[model samples]
Target: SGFRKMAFPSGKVEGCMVQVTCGTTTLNGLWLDDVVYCPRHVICTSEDMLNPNYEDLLIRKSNHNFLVQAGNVQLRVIGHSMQNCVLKLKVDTANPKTPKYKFVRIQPGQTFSVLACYNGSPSGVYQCAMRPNFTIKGSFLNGSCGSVGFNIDYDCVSFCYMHHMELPTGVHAGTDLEGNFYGPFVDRQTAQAAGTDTTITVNVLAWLYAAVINGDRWFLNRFTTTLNDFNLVAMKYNYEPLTQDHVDILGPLSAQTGIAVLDMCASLKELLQNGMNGRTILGSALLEDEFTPFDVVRQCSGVT
Candidate 1:
């Protein structure tokens, strides 16, 4: 086990920390009394130690399939209990179009997943409006609590169709080449024409592959525009542009270098090819340390 457990100096047996760090991901599990709260990519603070009811905070922090972060990495929390708990999720589904409210009730041992779109698109976008007045109610099994109600403040999250891909389930469609999360632009024109306000970064190789697979020129143009920017950025940094080896590995539209990029492209192409051959690539097939290009084409046109 890569996890490390240590006790605090306050002389409290229940006060301990279980932590694991891998690359850019970190898991910190804080043990307080009877409750174990684990937060990914977030450090446990003194305030976190003081609050015994951090599960509610964790629920509020979750979004888009209960995923705190979307990438090739997976975060796991163990030894925590959530028995006899019922969650009521109040969602604002009618923002930026209509004023409608959707209430979702989640039972114990139930998994609640929702898709949210950040772009200003009404179709297939699950909008959870983070108004200040939204409230969540839950019942816990602990003797110190029966039923608890608290106001939840949240931010809007965009949904991507890549997660719904039949072949590669849970594939993420956000993030640029720099690993920054970006929402889908309206169209190729908006993605390519905009300067700083609406301009966004994308994984050109993945998007280009998607374009070839789907025969969509929108994705093709988006890939080209992004690749052009990637070349300019490389030039600015005094780095080499895409070489023949890159083209040989990833095709014409592919623009990037290094072994990591090559491996990711090979894996992605293999994943796509297998999908075409009616084969499903399970998560277990990929190694934990392998950097799979899970980022996909960011387009809002065909999300159904």
Candidate 2:
């Protein structure tokens, strides 16, 4: 008659799954949908003990599948006969990219942590509470945690913030943006005069370098498109079809510099190894340089 798209909270008493001294309160996984993680050793009552050991691997996977989120994801808990339970989840936003989690009780006040974990009652941030009496105490973490993914344009930023010793002004994230910046077609001297507006010169140079090394983002804007095209044909293919791009024809850091592509195969290989996820940095990485940030990611592919 009608379509039925499965519902959540498929019915399970809402509370911590730990039984402590009471009889086991089994989770009816067949119907429950508002699925949530539980501490393998949730000590529901004082009878649990003062110290608990943790499970070596505290990974929680859905009996059916996974719900992927990019930014912040909150962890929830339910308690049953939790009358005298003093323990709750740690506040650390358990990050999947860091090398510290699931190890020791990694809270913020670890004498060296920058209150970064924000754990503890009055702490700034926190997360955890995986295993119980044995491996649960401070090792595993969970929280109404928050995380962020940002595109790291450090290379471009270096030019704006370091090379020219400033940052470009004006609209950003399309938010309450301010500051005067270099135009999309501004000159080096104009950029220098603009101060911290937009440091495109370095980006420009980097772009040239990328063209020569990678050979994808090379196009003669208005400066030296013809000369660059010819240069690429000359060096890489013995004046053939055209393989590589020249970084900077002038090589002398002049205003209107020449550029070219070298070798397609070599360039693509090099780019796959060096170019920013399409010349743009995204919070795809942890902090600023994590090996992998998101469980799933989207990037430009040669196929597309």
| Backbone Cα, N, C clashes tallied per candidate | 5, 46
- Shift of residue 270 alpha carbon in model 1, Å: 28
Q: All candidates: CA RMSD in angstroms?
A: 21.6, 22.0
Cα-based lDDT for every prediction = 0.24, 0.21
Best-matching candidate per TM-score: 1
Give one digit per residue, the lDDT tens place, for model 1 in 193-268: 2111211112234333443444432211211223354556545433235444444544322443222344433443
- Per-residue CA lDDT of model 2 for 58-101, tens digit only, reads 22212222222212343332322111111122222332332111
Candidate 1: clashing residue pairs, number: 5
In order of appearance, the predictions have TM-scores of 0.19, 0.18
Candidate 1, residue 289: the lDDT equals: 13
